Amino acid sequence: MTYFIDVPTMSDLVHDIGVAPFIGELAAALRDDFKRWQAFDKSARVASHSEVGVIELMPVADKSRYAFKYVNGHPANTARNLHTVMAFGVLADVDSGYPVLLSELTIATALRTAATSLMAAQALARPNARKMALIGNGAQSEFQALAFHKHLGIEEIVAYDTDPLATAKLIANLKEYSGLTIRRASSVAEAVKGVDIITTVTADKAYATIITPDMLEPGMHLNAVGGDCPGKTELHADVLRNARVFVEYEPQTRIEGEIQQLPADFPVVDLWRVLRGETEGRQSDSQVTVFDSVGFALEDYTVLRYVLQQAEKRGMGTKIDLVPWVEDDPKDLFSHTRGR
Amino acid sequence: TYFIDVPTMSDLVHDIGVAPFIGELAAALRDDFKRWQAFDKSARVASHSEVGVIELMPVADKSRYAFKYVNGHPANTARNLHTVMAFGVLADVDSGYPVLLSELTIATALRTAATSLMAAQALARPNARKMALIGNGAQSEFQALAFHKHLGIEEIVAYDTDPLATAKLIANLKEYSGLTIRRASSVAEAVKGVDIITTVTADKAYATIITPDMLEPGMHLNAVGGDCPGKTELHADVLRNARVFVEYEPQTRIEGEIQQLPADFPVVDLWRVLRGETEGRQSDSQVTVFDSVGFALEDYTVLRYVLQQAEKRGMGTKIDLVPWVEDDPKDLFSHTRGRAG
Numbered sequence A: 001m002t003y004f005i006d007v008p009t010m011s012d013l014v015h016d017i018g019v020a021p022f023i024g025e026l027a028a029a030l031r032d033d034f035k036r037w038q039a040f041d042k043s044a045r046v047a048s049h050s051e052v053g054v055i056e057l058m059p060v061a062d063k064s065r066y067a068f069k070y071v072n073g074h075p076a077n078t079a080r081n082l083h084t085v086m087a088f089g090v091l092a093d094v095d096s097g098y099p100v101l102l103s104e105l106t107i108a109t110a111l112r113t114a115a116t117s118l119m120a121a122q123a124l125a126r127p128n129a130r131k132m133a134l135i136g137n138g139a140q141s142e143f144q145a146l147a148f149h150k151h152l153g154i155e156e157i158v159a160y161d162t163d164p165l166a167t168a169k170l171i172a173n174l175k176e177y178s179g180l181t182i183r184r185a186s187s188v189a190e191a192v193k194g195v196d197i198i199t200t201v202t203a204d205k206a207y208a209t210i211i212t213p214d215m216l217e218p219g220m221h222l223n224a225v226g227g228d229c230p231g232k233t234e235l236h237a238d239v240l241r242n243a244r245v246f247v248e249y250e251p252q253t254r255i256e257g258e259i260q261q262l263p264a265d266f267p268v269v270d271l272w273r274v275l276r277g278e279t280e281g282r283q284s285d286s287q288v289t290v291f292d293s294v295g296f297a298l299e300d301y302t303v304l305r306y307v308l309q310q311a312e313k314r315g316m317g318t319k320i321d322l323v324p325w326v327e328d329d330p331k332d333l334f335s336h337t338r339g340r
Numbered sequence B: 001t002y003f004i005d006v007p008t009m010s011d012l013v014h015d016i017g018v019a020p021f022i023g024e025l026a027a028a029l030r031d032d033f034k035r036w037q038a039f040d041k042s043a044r045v046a047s048h049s050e051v052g053v054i055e056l057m058p059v060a061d062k063s064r065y066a067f068k069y070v071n072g073h074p075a076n077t078a079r080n081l082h083t084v085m086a087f088g089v090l091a092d093v094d095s096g097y098p099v100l101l102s103e104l105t106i107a108t109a110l111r112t113a114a115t116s117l118m119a120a121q122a123l124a125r126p127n128a129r130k131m132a133l134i135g136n137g138a139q140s141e142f143q144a145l146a147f148h149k150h151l152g153i154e155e156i157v158a159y160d161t162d163p164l165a166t167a168k169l170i171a172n173l174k175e176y177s178g179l180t181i182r183r184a185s186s187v188a189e190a191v192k193g194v195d196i197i198t199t200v201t202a203d204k205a206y207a208t209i210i211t212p213d214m215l216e217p218g219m220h221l222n223a224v225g226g227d228c229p230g231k232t233e234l235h236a237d238v239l240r241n242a243r244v245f246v247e248y249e250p251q252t253r254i255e256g257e258i259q260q261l262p263a264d265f266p267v268v269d270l271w272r273v274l275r276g277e278t279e280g281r282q283s284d285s286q287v288t289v290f291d292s293v294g295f296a297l298e299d300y301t302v303l304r305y306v307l308q309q310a311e312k313r314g315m316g317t318k319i320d321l322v323p324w325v326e327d328d329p330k331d332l333f334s335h336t337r338g339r340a341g
């Protein structure tokens, strides 16, 4: 009983639920899981670096369920008509090790990342937010835009991308949402002027200063999503020093996040503690808050469980023979060598 | 992405033949072990539970990336489930694209037998002819055939606490008339006078399947069963009386039989033995121990082998695991409109 949800099936699932509800429901599910932070067997994801990218495995588990996601990060892929980010994952039973679900996670990753950013913003950004800058208008952009528009009251988005066609795509994809205005800016500095939230989702395997100190205004919240690997950043180190920085899983973020540019003792705040109301999140209206996001296995665990439950209710997905199921003699593996 | 499921792998292995599969794989493993320094190696990541473990085993070179998901639950057989279940992926390094998704439960038994064979060829006495096989479960038939067909073992003395397991082993290999397999009533009885002792028992605990009093000069121990911290088969003093060989030292220091010895206890890297940089067996009376726990490179090799074998037979099914080439790779949102939209 290993169920498989491929790309087109996930497409039908997301279409059925709706992108907005999917993100909203997922953010709520993520919030609850983050509150249960200490119940999970956590670890920094394993990364295998190459010349133009990275391939990583992201495991996590509690006492009953195990989950992991395979994911790559190759910014140069788009030049070859491939996605910068591709992923898939598995949800398994802890007491038997049996893989219950194998699922595409490329579409799901964009959804969980948007939901995670939304969850963090709901807890860290000023409640009156209405304008957001969206730097990087690629694969993640539409999801981030909708998450903030439908669930955080963002009515206006000022977008910028080195690739003008990417911005055109973003505007065209969301035009159907009349309550949301999205306009193209000629530069990052122009896009971020006067915004309440800055979301960065650029893809470039190198140290970059997308956001510089001069762009910061009192009360801003920075949703820094693009940088997510050692040697891959989007914020100038001083931007972090002028803000209260929040992270997912500190041990991993110290190596892959924006904070990799600062001393190992630079103070950061664990988001799960804020969500439990045990540690202060935003401390004032003038403060600048930064969500140093790199992605963490727990978020994939949440979306995998969500997808399994939602697909089950809709009778979606197909069964595959990935590993042996129950057998008369589980010690007779050799019998399988005689052919099906 | 192509997918090879359990029944397809069964047909594939059946067509290649278990012995040939193990032989060809051992040759391939030797080549990969020789270029050990070309791989980005790491100790597998394990998630421990009260009755088992779930692990991810990645490894990669400049061209290919591979990983295997595998569990280790000794109590599973009481629930008619396999103690070991696994599957893995072979991916392209420069794009991250997963080329092959494959069952690896059957393949794991084959690569483990091939690895044990490869080590034995370099560590056991060349005149070995009798082997003790402790643990007659899933791995046993594969280990038995690997040694019989490729290392001249003509007699195996088997023991398992479960008598039906031993009966299964004997019945499964009865067709190999050049191989004699007989049931012993205890481990001590089974290992008496053997040239090689292969242990593949499954018990999540510190076990002394083999004690020092059982050792005889010149024996080679293919210790395969223990493969996790707190899960061993050999008494620590058995190791003190031998030259010990490992796969990937950093990982084995944690999961192997040597976890019971000082961090400074000397061990020998198998790949270096194969390269001829250090000695395998040094004397006929020496006791050698291959402290085997399994390592990602072995799964990398079998995944490449399976892909090649399946490809020339046109076997495997295409699956939409991740997006492939598209007009606009930056438009992931288009996928939220349903497969029709």
Ligand SMILES: NC(=O)c1ccc[n+]([C@@H]2O[C@H](COP(=O)([O-])OP(=O)(O)OC[C@H]3O[C@@H](n4cnc5c(N)ncnc54)[C@H](O)[C@@H]3O)[C@@H](O)[C@H]2O)c1
Pocket (backbone or CB within 6 Å): A073, A075, A078, A084, A085, A109, A110, A113, A135, A136, A137, A138, A139, A140, A141, A160, A161, A162, A163, A166, A201, A202, A203, A204, A208, A210, A224, A225, A226, A227, A228, A293, A294, A295, A296, B329, B330
């Ligand atoms: N934090 C997380 O959880 C998480 C999960 C999603 C993806 N990732 C990261 O998010 C980033 C974006 O992912 P994606 O799938 O949208 O990639 P993508 O390649 O589809 O889009 C990235 C966009 O950034 C633009 N860009 C690059 N450099 C720029 C610059 N200096 N200024 C303005 N625009 C620039 C590109 O032209 C491109 O359109 C990647 O770096 C990826 O690894 C992180």
Ligand SMILES: NC(=O)c1ccc[n+]([C@@H]2O[C@H](COP(=O)([O-])OP(=O)(O)OC[C@H]3O[C@@H](n4cnc5c(N)ncnc54)[C@H](O)[C@@H]3O)[C@@H](O)[C@H]2O)c1
Pocket (backbone or CB within 6 Å): A330, A331, B072, B074, B077, B083, B084, B108, B109, B112, B134, B135, B136, B137, B138, B139, B140, B159, B160, B161, B162, B165, B200, B201, B202, B203, B207, B209, B223, B224, B225, B226, B227, B292, B293, B294, B295
């Ligand atoms: N080193 C490696 O690369 C590698 C790869 C294969 C599997 N593993 C390990 O190999 C072991 C066996 O795997 P399997 O698939 O054959 O499992 P299995 O459960 O099918 O068979 C194990 C057999 O051991 C027997 N056994 C348990 N305790 C015993 C004892 N004290 N004395 C004699 N027999 C005993 C059981 O009754 C059973 O028949 C497991 O512990 C597994 O984790 C290691």
Ligand code: NA
Pocket (backbone or CB within 6 Å): A224, A225, A226, A227, A228, A257, A258, A292, A293, A294
């Ligand atoms: Na980031």
Ligand code: NA
Pocket (backbone or CB within 6 Å): B223, B224, B225, B226, B227, B256, B257, B291, B292, B293
């Ligand atoms: Na072992």
